[PDB]
Structure 1
Amino acid sequence: KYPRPHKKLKQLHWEKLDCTDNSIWGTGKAEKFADDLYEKGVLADLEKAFAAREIKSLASKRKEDLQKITFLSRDISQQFGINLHMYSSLSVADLVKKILNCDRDFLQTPSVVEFLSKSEIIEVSVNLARNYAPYSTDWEGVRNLEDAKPPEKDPNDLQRADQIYLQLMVNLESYWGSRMRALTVVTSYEREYNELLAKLRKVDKAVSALQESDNLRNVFNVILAVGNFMNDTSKQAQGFKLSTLQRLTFIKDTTNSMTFLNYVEKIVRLNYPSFNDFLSELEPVLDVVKVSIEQLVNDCKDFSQSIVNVERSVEIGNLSDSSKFHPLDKVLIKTLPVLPEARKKGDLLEDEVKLTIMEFESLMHTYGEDSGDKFAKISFFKKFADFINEYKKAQAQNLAAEEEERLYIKH
């Protein structure tokens, strides 16, 4: 019974009320204005005015990559188009050249280097490979583009994101891993060296501060002293372990106004304030409290042995037979140029870490930490740190408390 327009109109997405029951709708008023405003002219324009204009639709060219085959999990197909997002505009092939042909724009951005050598991206399953065989290649011998060419079952039926996975993680499978471990070293070894060696100095030049700080040593000596004077016969001792440090703070005085560590501090500064240098000398130790020293090493054993392995590969396998190297894979033209000096610094760090660890384990053996006990091996520094600050704190408390003990002294 309602009046209606000739062309589509701008819809009024409202939320209808269902039951009319005892509303305001139901008295049919709605129906009067209905025709009324139609004959009275009105709707005629309301029509013309809110005429919903047409809606264009395009894109397509990248839409259809939908219809084409895909053996790759949305995630992956996605996290390709994510990092290979700068190569957007390049065709499925243009791009692969730029990659095998190790450009200076590709190798520069690690985001892409790292991606392409991601275990999760490299490793192809039989269940996977199979799906890609009817489109693969061998490059055994092949020294030109047009040669190989046995498409057999055509690759164009795959989604763009799918194709790359093919011409790269599949078709150059055999060596892609190492090819990448190489190109990486190429692109990384530099900083990825300075970075460690420095990480290594922040140790060596704190382990140093500890070596020699007759100061520190003395302070302990002063504690051992007061210790023995306090402890009883059965508890006397020609020396103690660091594990003692943290329980200095508990030993309160009588009037719980003093933390034993206070006296110890007060005592130095007012009989030997020629020692409160340890609280200056030894900071470099704080500059490495959380350093996983047992994994700093290993990161270094990783550095060298990684190179010592892009090496092994250039010769005895993987990266030798320039035959499988898809004609263009300009990796060697890029690896070798640097493989030399790289390895140099690979043996450098080694030396350094030799020179360092052994040293370190020595300072530890000193206070009694067994260079061979995961724990002290690292939880070492922390106790020196902990002590210091527990001390740099007792110092404060004491140096301030000693202020208040001047005014309530003068006034």
Structure 2
Amino acid sequence: KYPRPHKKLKQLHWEKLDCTDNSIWGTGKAEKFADDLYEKGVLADLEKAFAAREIKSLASKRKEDLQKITFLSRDISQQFGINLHMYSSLSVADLVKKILNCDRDFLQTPSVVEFLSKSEIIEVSVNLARNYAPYSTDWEGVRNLEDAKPPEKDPNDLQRADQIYLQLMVNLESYWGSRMRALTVVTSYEREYNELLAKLRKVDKAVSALQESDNLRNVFNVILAVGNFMNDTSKQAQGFKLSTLQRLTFIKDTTNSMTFLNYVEKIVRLNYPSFNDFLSELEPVLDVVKVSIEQLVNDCKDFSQSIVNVERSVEIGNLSDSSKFHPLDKVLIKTLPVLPEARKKGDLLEDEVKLTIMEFESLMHTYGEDSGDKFAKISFFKKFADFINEYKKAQAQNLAAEEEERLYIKH
């Protein structure tokens, strides 16, 4: 009186509530589900999905192709099946014809393209190339799968993981990397570009904000005024470096509560309120904080350079010679139509970046920082950001302290 499986299944060791009492159980529903699911075949799927004993058929095939010969590490041979699991159901033949035909789904799977491009994966040691030498094929000159014919020994004796490594990383070593590098570009340039441009925009907004922040500069003049008022003649100044910002908290008042910065804020808020807008005006500076304009600029170069290199290999490199390829390999049918569009994105990007660099550096000279100094460039926005946060913390404290005093003076 319940559907039952023909083959024994995995068990669920639940703690059963002994009886259908004054509870949520015993409404009859569960059996209706059992019946419904059964009619719809769901139970039959479950029966295969959770059979307790591995099908004898697959059991042996896996026991057999597990004793064969392998020259790959326990790690590599392992992560091979992992990263290519979506192809568990294909014969090395089809899986390989999959990667070489470059099939649309293959390319749209970012994780495999990376794995097939991994260093330790692509790089074949001298020994390994020897170990696999016996079963190796050449392909150079071969104009079709059904015309090569040089077996030299047998591949099937090799475990699946090694059969793949062989067919690609070894038999194509003469140009595997270049092939991958080529495809990785065709399959990334689009978003890499967007990403880069995204970051580049954050920088542009920050630069603009600082560039046009009269309030910020005004606060700076208030700080300068007060500063000169306190300092003796040896320390009088016409202006100050940004380092100055990070040291306005080390000075406390008599009662030792308030900080120099608190007073500045108090002075601004109660005498030149508008100046405080700079806090809002400079959110873009707070946002760009997690971006190294140094790293960004280099990323562009690498972006362009990668596209460049691929173009070389395609015109005079390991990919200029198409008879050196595997008959089934078709990187070029995919790659070539794309290069010009990728290059186009590269140029676009470069132009923007160069403009930004220009404006940024020019902004630094405005605040007396050296555009030459690597560190100075990198810490430029942090300094404004930290200051802003400090100002905020100070404004907070003053608003608090003032409220208490607004009370005490009453009572």
Residues 223 and 64 (structure 1), Cα distance of their counterparts in 2 relative to 1, 3 Å cut = same
Residues 254 and 56 (structure 1), Cα distance of their counterparts in 2 relative to 1, 3 Å cut = same
Alpha-carbon displacement from aligned partner over 1:341-368 (angstroms, at most 9, x marks no partner): 1110111111111111122111112222
Q: Tell me, in whole angstroms, the C-alpha distance in 1 between the residues paired with 2:38 and 2:276.
A: 98
Residues 12 and 320 (structure 1), Cα distance of their counterparts in 2 relative to 1, 3 Å cut = closer
Q: Which ranges in structure 1 are unaligned for 5 or more consecutive residues?
A: none
SS at match of 1:58: helix
Equivalent in the alignment of 1:50: 50
**% same residue:** 100
**1:224 positional shift:** 1.0
Equivalent in the alignment of 1:101: 101
SS at match of 1:59: helix
Residues 64 and 223 (structure 1), Cα distance of their counterparts in 2 relative to 1, 3 Å cut = same
Q: Tell me, in whole angstroms, the C-alpha distance in 1 between the residues paired with 2:118 and 2:250.
A: 51
SS at match of 1:63: helix
Q: Tell me, in whole angstroms, the C-alpha distance in 2 between the residues paired with 1:168 and 1:239.
A: 65
SS at match of 1:326: coil
SS at match of 1:124: coil
Q: Which ranges in structure 2 are unaligned for 5 or more consecutive residues?
A: none
**1:180 positional shift:** 0.6
**1:3 positional shift:** 42
**1:257 positional shift:** 2.3
Q: Which of 70-79 and 148-157 deviates more?
A: 148-157
Residues 291 and 36 (structure 1), Cα distance of their counterparts in 2 relative to 1, 3 Å cut = closer
Residues 398 and 322 (structure 1), Cα distance of their counterparts in 2 relative to 1, 3 Å cut = same
Alpha-carbon displacement from aligned partner over 1:204-226 (angstroms, at most 9, x marks no partner): 11011111101101111111111
Residues 33 and 401 (structure 1), Cα distance of their counterparts in 2 relative to 1, 3 Å cut = closer
TM-score normalised by structure 1 residue count: 0.85
Q: Tell me, in whole angstroms, the C-alpha distance in 1 between the residues paired with 2:117 and 2:237.
A: 58
Residues 386 and 333 (structure 1), Cα distance of their counterparts in 2 relative to 1, 3 Å cut = same
Residues 26 and 78 (structure 1), Cα distance of their counterparts in 2 relative to 1, 3 Å cut = closer
Q: Tell me, in whole angstroms, the C-alpha distance in 2 between the residues paired with 1:408 and 1:221.
A: 34
SS at match of 1:337: helix
Residues 396 and 9 (structure 1), Cα distance of their counterparts in 2 relative to 1, 3 Å cut = closer
**1:14 positional shift:** 25
Residues 402 and 124 (structure 1), Cα distance of their counterparts in 2 relative to 1, 3 Å cut = same
Alpha-carbon displacement from aligned partner over 1:226-258 (angstroms, at most 9, x marks no partner): 111100001111111111111101110111121
Residues 113 and 16 (structure 1), Cα distance of their counterparts in 2 relative to 1, 3 Å cut = closer
Q: Tell me, in whole angstroms, the C-alpha distance in 2 between the residues paired with 1:331 and 1:36.
A: 50
Q: Which of 12-21 and 246-255 deviates more?
A: 12-21
Residues 48 and 225 (structure 1), Cα distance of their counterparts in 2 relative to 1, 3 Å cut = closer
Residues 193 and 41 (structure 1), Cα distance of their counterparts in 2 relative to 1, 3 Å cut = closer
Q: Tell me, in whole angstroms, the C-alpha distance in 1 between the residues paired with 2:139 and 2:40.
A: 81
**1:271 positional shift:** 1.4
**1:285 positional shift:** 0.6
Q: Tell me, in whole angstroms, the C-alpha distance in 1 between the residues paired with 2:214 and 2:42.
A: 101
Q: Tell me, in whole angstroms, the C-alpha distance in 1 between the residues paired with 2:38 and 2:332.
A: 81
SS at match of 2:93: helix
Q: Tell me, in whole angstroms, the C-alpha distance in 2 between the residues paired with 1:406 and 1:290.
A: 40
Alpha-carbon displacement from aligned partner over 1:148-190 (angstroms, at most 9, x marks no partner): 2211122121111001001100111111111111111111111
4+ residue stretches of structure 1 with deviation over 2 A? 1-58
Residues 360 and 95 (structure 1), Cα distance of their counterparts in 2 relative to 1, 3 Å cut = same
**1:77 positional shift:** 0.4
**1:293 positional shift:** 2.0
Q: Say yes or no: does 1:311 pair with 2:306.
A: no
SS at match of 1:410: coil
Q: Tell me, in whole angstroms, the C-alpha distance in 1 between the residues paired with 2:35 and 2:201.
A: 90
Whose helix fraction is larger, Structure 1's or Structure 2's? 2
TM-score normalised by structure 2 residue count: 0.85
Q: Is the 8 A contact 2:137 2:152 kept in 1?
A: no
Residues 126 and 270 (structure 1), Cα distance of their counterparts in 2 relative to 1, 3 Å cut = same
**1:273 positional shift:** 0.8
**1:43 positional shift:** 40
Q: Tell me, in whole angstroms, the C-alpha distance in 2 between the residues paired with 1:250 and 1:227.
A: 14
Q: Say what the alpha-carbon RMSD is for the aligned residues.
A: 10.3
SS at match of 1:223: helix
Q: Tell me, in whole angstroms, the C-alpha distance in 2 between the residues paired with 1:405 and 1:349.
A: 56
Q: Tell me, in whole angstroms, the C-alpha distance in 2 between the residues paired with 1:158 and 1:135.
A: 9
SS at match of 2:319: coil
Q: Tell me, in whole angstroms, the C-alpha distance in 2 between the residues paired with 1:140 and 1:65.
A: 30
Q: Tell me, in whole angstroms, the C-alpha distance in 2 between the residues paired with 1:392 and 1:39.
A: 66
